[PDB]
Amino acid sequence: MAKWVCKICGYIYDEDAGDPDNGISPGTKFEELPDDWVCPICGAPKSEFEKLED
């Protein structure tokens, strides 16, 4: 599945890994993240993430 990078701090949201400590199970697509989800490192909103793909 896809990876997305936080343009602020460099955290990688890996869809295969999810973010289970913050309520997101593995295999959760970025588009399916709640509107209130933020970067677990720096707190950046979803707007500041970019998908790693051409």
Of 25-54, which residues contact Fe ion (CB under 5 A)?
A: 39, 41-42, 44
CA gap 4, 6 in Å, rounded: 7
Stretch that binds ligand D3O, among 5-13, 22-30, 36-44 (CB under 6 A): 22-30
- 50 annotated binding-site participant: no
Q: Does 10 bind ligand D3O (CB under 6 A)?
A: no
> Considering only CA atoms, which of 34, 33, 35, 36 is closest in space to residue 51?
33
Contact partners, residue 31, CB within 8 Å, separation at least 6 = none
List residues binding Fe ion (CB under 5 A): 6, 8-9, 11, 39, 41-42, 44
